[PDB]
């Protein structure tokens, strides 16, 4: 019983992650159900993702998103296959907001946990 | 204008060879340090994949898959200091493999990496 | 309707947090269900808490824990009252492992999310 | 030994006055910066409460509650260098007040603070 990163995923915020694994890379499309300020994520709150995925029964993943307005996000996670059979992607993320210069950037990094379930 | 393409070095002694073609970043990462011995394999090198914005002080996000299945990610921004230096200010996460969901709580480390240009 | 920080909470790993407010401070007991390396959290996987709670309806909290073998942890968070009447304590945490020196400390900090519910 | 008790300053210019009592730390933090005008109060100072371990290079964990409801926590270690210099090495989180659960998703920031002595 394997956890397969390829698929369509939904997080606890209601964001959708559509992902295709090929070789050791991932591509696809992230639609965020929220943004940090109006505009940030763009026209349909959507952007391309690019990243890596490991081999194995419970693979690790890492992937990046650049948001239309110049902020950017990164996730690292592992695909686990639960005892009830649900496929689950446990991730932490960083969101990096554009700063004006180095001195004002101390506060430009946010973090959190996204849990993605297959739909 | 700060530019991401080039060869960089961090406070740990690690090296980052980066090349942008537009919004994409590719390259190679050599880490001077490892969480377990050989976790990054014998050359401690891996490929890098990510994104870089446009603008003069662009933001950057990139991932590395390590040889034995851990993976790191960096976000940051390319700054021109007063003195002419180009600096990549980043924060990273290192995700170690875990056996099951229940052991995964302790799987994510973080830190800050300052990359300077060789 | 408010969120009340005082009491016994339980998070996703089964760890129990007992909070007593004394003014702006919080004191109490943390019993972790899990530890890094056997005995890191001491004989009873238990230690005391110290920190702060704000004055809202939905207060923010900050608290810290020194474990027996010297690693330390801190959580920051807010106490939300939900539509269904439930009180959820939403935190993020940092675990600091002891290192021998500055250079080998690069990997000494881990992070996660803890969602506490009231018992 | 590295001694936590004292007056400390970090890369941002913020000042940290702490004293140690058993395994408890107390004192005042004066931040050189804030998220919004006045988040740290008119004087940008607040009390600190936390913990410090025994040993030659002790670990530390402290909190601060800010005037307008946000809060910050630091975890770290007091490393003593070759040159005899004492150095507090930390990572922090800053939680901002949110109106409700759903809109709290982006309410946590982090960073590194490195403190030197006066
Ligand atoms: O606010 C921004 O700068 C762009 C949108 C940010 C979306 C973030 S990425 C991490 C978190 N998880 C989500 O699904 N959305 C938010
Ligand atoms: O430990 C592993 O699982 C593989 C090596 C990780 C190297 C990390 S990546 C974050 C940090 N920055 C560096 O330059 N090296 C370490
Ligand atoms: O591993 C150690 O060094 C001591 C025990 C740490 C337990 C951590 S603290 C954050 C997380 N949440 C819990 O409930 N327990 C773990
Ligand atoms: O913005 C706020 O809500 C309150 C002030 C935050 C000050 C932060 S705490 C982490 C960082 N280190 C400092 O010395 N100052 C900032």
Author numbering:
A (entry chain E), C (entry chain G): 4 to 122
B (entry chain H), D (entry chain F): 5 to 122
Give the published text.
In the current study, we present the characterisation of an avidin-like protein in zebrafish, called zebavidin. Although zebavidin has many unique physicochemical and structural features, it clearly can be classified as a new member of the avidin protein family based on its structure and function. Structural and functional characterisation confirmed the hypothesis that zebavidin is a new member of the avidin protein family and binds tightly to biotin, even though the biotin-binding affinity of zebavidin is substantially lower than that measured for avidin or streptavidin. Zebavidin is an avidin-like protein from zebrafish and highly expressed in the gonads of adult fish but our preliminary results suggest that it is not critical for the development of the embryo.
The homotetramer of zebavidin resembles that of chicken avidin and is a typical “dimer of dimers”. Each of the 16 monomers in the asymmetric unit is structurally highly similar to each other and the Cα atoms of the monomers superimpose with a root mean square deviation (rmsd) of less than 0.3 Å; the tetramers superimpose with the same accuracy. The major structural differences are found at the biotin-binding loop, the L3,4-loop, which is three or more residues longer in zebavidin than in the other known avidin structures; the sequence and conformation of the L3,4-loop is also unique and especially affects the conformation of the adjacent L5,6-loop, which, in turn, is one amino acid shorter than in other avidin structures. The unique L3,4-loop and L5,6-loop affect the mode of biotin binding in zebavidin, even though most biotin-binding residues are conserved in zebavidin when compared to other avidins. In contrast, Glu38, Ser39, Thr40, Ala43, Ala44, Trp70, Ser74 and Leu98, which surround the valeric acid moiety of biotin, mostly have unique interactions. The L5,6-loop is shorter than in other avidins and a residue equivalent to Phe72 in avidin is missing, affecting the positioning and conformation of Lys72, which is not in direct contact with biotin even though the equivalent residue Ser73/Ser72 in avidin/xenavidin is hydrogen bonded to biotin. However, in zebavidin a structural water molecule is found at a position matching that of the side-chain oxygen atom of Ser73 of avidin suggesting that this water molecule, and at least two other structural water molecules near the valeric acid moiety, may be important for biotin binding. The free and relatively polar Cys75 in nonpolar environment at the IF1,4 interface of zebavidin, together with several other unique interactions found at the same interface, may also weaken the quaternary structure, enabling transient oligomeric states under different buffer conditions.
